[model samples]
Target chain A: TDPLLPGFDYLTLHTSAARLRVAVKGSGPPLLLLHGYPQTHLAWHRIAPRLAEDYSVVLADLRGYGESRALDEEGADYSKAALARDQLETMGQLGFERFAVIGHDRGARVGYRLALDHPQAVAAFVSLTVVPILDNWAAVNKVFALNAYHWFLLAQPYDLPERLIGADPEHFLDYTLRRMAQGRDIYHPQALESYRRAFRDPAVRHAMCEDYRAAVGVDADADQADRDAGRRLQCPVQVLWQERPYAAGQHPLEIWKTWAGQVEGAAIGASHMLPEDAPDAVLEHLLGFLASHREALR
Target chain B: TDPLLPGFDYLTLHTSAARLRVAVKGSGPPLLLLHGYPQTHLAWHRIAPRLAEDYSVVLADLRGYGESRALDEEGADYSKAALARDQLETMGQLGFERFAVIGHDRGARVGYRLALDHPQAVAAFVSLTVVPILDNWAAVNKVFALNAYHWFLLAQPYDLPERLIGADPEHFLDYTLRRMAQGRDIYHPQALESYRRAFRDPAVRHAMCEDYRAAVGVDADADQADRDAGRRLQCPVQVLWQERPYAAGQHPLEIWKTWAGQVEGAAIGASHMLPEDAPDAVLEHLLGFLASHREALR
Candidate 1:
């Protein structure tokens, strides 16, 4: 009873006319979370409720993963920037004037873009396990030269990758989880089943491939465009990484010294699956950022 | 002109009573995607269009992002599982019968839970840069021991982190981006600005914290609940990961082997940003997966 945990509810949102799914829980500051690959809203299983004391946590499937329907209509937008808009709208409907955000891996990518495109709406921003965009582009400089596989696999246009991924959704997710999870044993049998079940949809497969394609094609240009436009964020930020001494050096907080006015950046000794592998650690940093900097935020 | 080069669209979704904003694009198979922390829907920029060729793509920002409102209402739901429902509704309204999906980082967690809760909807799956559930009770994990900062920062029931991050959204995102960018510079000034603009709202700030808190608290319990329900996935699988010689030597395919029927995996040379850094290689792998395993998928 000490925890005084918040209640859970099944929330249903309508991103399109054909889709409607349930989100669990209610109350407090709304933390609408986006999930990563091979996983679902459950990634936060270890952390969501702890924040409920002061927040109304919100969980969701991106588009086609859960009950969220595909955008087969005449005017559906699926670009990363467009996706950011949906999150903004969801918050408005729920009556939260503004809220903070955190996303891991793929979800972190989404979180990055959302903060960039709609900086006014985001509060504290955190990315677990990965770095931000401009660096993402630059780091690839050497990666493409050596491991041509990542560029070719994730960057290809839709049909090509979709055909390749085919019906083996679990294979794709499980494969990544293993490498990313490193020594962490977060992949339990039940969780594995959920990943397998998600791969059952052809549409989701297609969307997955298209997501990769855009990352290389239009997304790059869009990011460049935004950069060219003199876009500059105006928020407090934190960045953390997994504990891998041999995985190159820690991220360069010095770079952040330029754009960000005030920043707190660090690398954790976890795998890429930072949130799942070390939920408590991730939460601590996030909460610390909040507690120590109330003057900056409000 | 170049088939419009595949673009993203910003659309409003009436997920709840309010008009939720959504990003959508592509055509063919329907795939839903979610993003992770310190980032947003923008991460899918390179991947979405590629998958769009054979599938309709839907990219979404979680609540408290971009133009989307946070669930700050007294009756709002804040759990990651709860937020999953909002995204599911967004997709359902878009007209997807069944689809495939990919979730990275935070989004991956949401996607994982979504699949477990709604087994019938998803078809195929892929996880980029992520792991499984958070075993928070296990206090002796090496990863957690090393990076204990975020645990307290995010899980605390308050707006401290949000306020700190929002104080300077641009710098906030930049600080995090710089820390993780590693050897290159992925974030640009414009991108930083965009992210800053979104953080102005207090609701988004609070939402971000709640999401992390849930992951450490209720979200973990939810995963256990799903497991107790005897839900299991029966789909093929594949995984892709950045090759790290220094980190724990677990192969992506090896991890999937435990759960996936036909597991396949690859190790890219890049650190994390495959789509942005090495779109070509990443896309190639995706194309190969979709093409080699086409008929079997249906």
Candidate 2:
């Protein structure tokens, strides 16, 4: 009943922790794509078909997102470890023992975690518009705090964010999407509608809060443990980020170098919605990075 | 008709920029009382009567709050400088060339500014639940930012906040007031009603946004300039703050010591609404501070 990417196949893949809505297309090496908050797999519609020509593209709605099944457990299941496990099992079910990942926002979070927690399953990783969560927690300033206020707001104890957001999910979602788009209306109408519909589910809202709550609490604890242990990601990382006023003065690539063995990326002349705002540029960078790391497929 | 402070005389006082609704009670050395956000002068109802017995208490709705008039100009007028001027002129008109100030939250901000901008006009100052503006600005972290998200939300450009808060002013006010009270209904019913009624006005909502917009912008600039100039409050300063997870770790006395020649205070076992939540304790501290500096009246 709803419009989706043409010529692509859609299905729900059940993992150990979740049932994720997935879309697979194309015919070459495997490429996995993950989406961020208040969004679904459809966020990649513009660039997916282009990448499909050379890569067997797989797009998925993260757990508790889109048609994906929501985890009803406590903060334990929403942790990035559990999320990365879902993606690992999803890839295994899709006949990909090891694959490259390209993720935006929250999905980027899961991507990096997959590289750290299940390095054998991820060959190469592309993290869009985020630094390491630990690094972010380390560098909190007034400017960063103000721009990313929602990180704190949503991370409040259970039911607070749910209640406030449930009051008017449409406005909250739309306002956030619009505000983070670098003052541009780059979102496609259909994609925006899908996000709106998914967010309308009260359970989705509650699950999202748990996801963030886990970030500040259990996730932070896990990340701190990893840092204490000096565990770093084995896979190559490509970090593409947005050029916003808050981040303009800092070097994100340098910050990533400590956590990653090989880090390379530049600031895209866009907002937090880097993929949507500048698809051609994102596509070029993504394609080039995948090509350089082609040996990972072996 | 609202049941106001008993034995207190109510009237409107005209300042150079706007008209302010004021309540005057008792007779002794003059002392000015100021209230904070989402509130009117009635916030001082409990402490005002007690303070009034020993000091001639003058409480006015900060311009644009309660029965006070809203500024018709740009954000410049809402800056603490302008608000301090309103209090300065209010005191001058009442035949007190110099007076003491007791302010809570936003009122405390204006009180400190008055001590800095018009030092001779203020004899002693008591600020409840705030640090120096610049220090407060510098100390922002995820915890503080989350607790005071309205500082960022309301400071957004003009109608962004005006429109959003205007959507449901009652809920907006009630939710914030409730959440900040730390699970206790400390606000008086009649005083709460007055705050609710005042906040319902569209003009008041707009004015409040301007107040916060000015705080993050012009107010910060002014505070920074004073810091650079090495200007400090000449009068004795007393700082009373809330003891909560958000503010528990910081040394407010050390922070305030930098801005004033003489500073002393301790943490009150309350939330943000120090006056309402723990008036008896606030009263004791306030009385002790004023009595210690009673020689200023001579």
- Quote each prediction's TM-score: 0.47, 0.91
Best by DockQ: 2
lDDT of each: 0.61, 0.83
Q: Score the docking of each candidate (DockQ).
A: 0.01, 0.44
Say which candidate scores most in lDDT.
2
In model 2, the runs with Cα more than 4 Å from the true position are A1-4, A71-76, A243-250, B1-4, B71-76, B162-168, B243-250
Task: Give the lowest summed-lDDT range of ten residues in model 1 chain A.
Answer: A141-150
- Best candidate, TM-score-wise? 2
